[PDB]
């Protein structure tokens, strides 16, 4: 209750601040993030799916565990943050940008990814909003599947187009959902993956892959 309600309140407050910032800077996006960086310089983006609980800042540390158990204000929270892989850049995007988040089943963080394993849900939520200092983007979902940690869906960059094409085709092959989105080697992708606590018994992960489109 003290954790829960307070945590929830703080997210509501930040969500509201970001919606105000968006409405204020109608064309731009850099001022919105410069403002959010005052709270935490590690806030690199924002992810939002309308009608769902996915409406969070995106953190990035030096490692993939910096924000595993820490929130946007660097406070200890079991559910931590939605965070980007430490290897990824935002100025000039890598071929595959990876975001991680908890899935504890209380309809928060990346609990939503589990819903994408259903065709009906996918059809009603094909586009996810992603914003950063460099632009406003759409995440055009094309693949959703459950895997293990024995499978590398985490690949950030490729040796050539053939390697990248292999990856894209494998991604579509693994998909539990049918999509009309066309993804080529000239495109950049975003991987959304569930993230478990350190040294957890659970090896299963839910992965949602999307094509990045710049809307700004």
């Amino acid at each position: 209750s003290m954790e829960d309600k307070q945590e929830r309140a703080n997210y509501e407050k930040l969500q509201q601040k970001f919606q105000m910032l968006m409405s204020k800077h109608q064309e731009h996006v850099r001022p919105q993030f410069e403002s959010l960086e005052k709270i935490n310089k590690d806030i690199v983006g924002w992810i939002k799916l309308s009608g769902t609980s996915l409406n969070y800042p995106v953190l990035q540390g030096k490692t993939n565990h910096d924000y595993l158990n820490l929130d946007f204000e660097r406070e200890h929270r079991r559910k931590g943050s939605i965070f980007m892989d430490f290897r990824n850049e935002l100025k000039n995007l890598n071929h595959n940008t990876i975001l991680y988040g908890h899935h504890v089943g209380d309809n928060t963080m990346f609990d939503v990814l589990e819903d994408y394993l259903k065709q009906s849900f996918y059809e009603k939520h094909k586009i996810i909003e992603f914003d950063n200092k460099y632009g406003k983007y759409q995440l055009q979902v094309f693949s959703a599947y459950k895997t293990t940690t024995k499978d590398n869906y985490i690949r950030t960059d490729f040796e050539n187009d053939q390697d990248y094409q292999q990856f894209l085709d494998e991604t579509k092959r693994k998909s539990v959902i049918n999509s009309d989105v066309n993804v080529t080697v000239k495109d950049r992708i975003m991987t959304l993956s569930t993230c478990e606590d350190a040294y957890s018994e659970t090896t299963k992960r839910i992965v949602v892959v999307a094509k990045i489109i710049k809307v700004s």
């Binding site: 565990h65 595993l68 892989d85 993230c195 992960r205």
Partner: peptide, 4 residues
């Protein structure tokens, strides 16, 4: 494998 990194932390996922």
């Amino acid at each position: 494998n990194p932390q996922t």
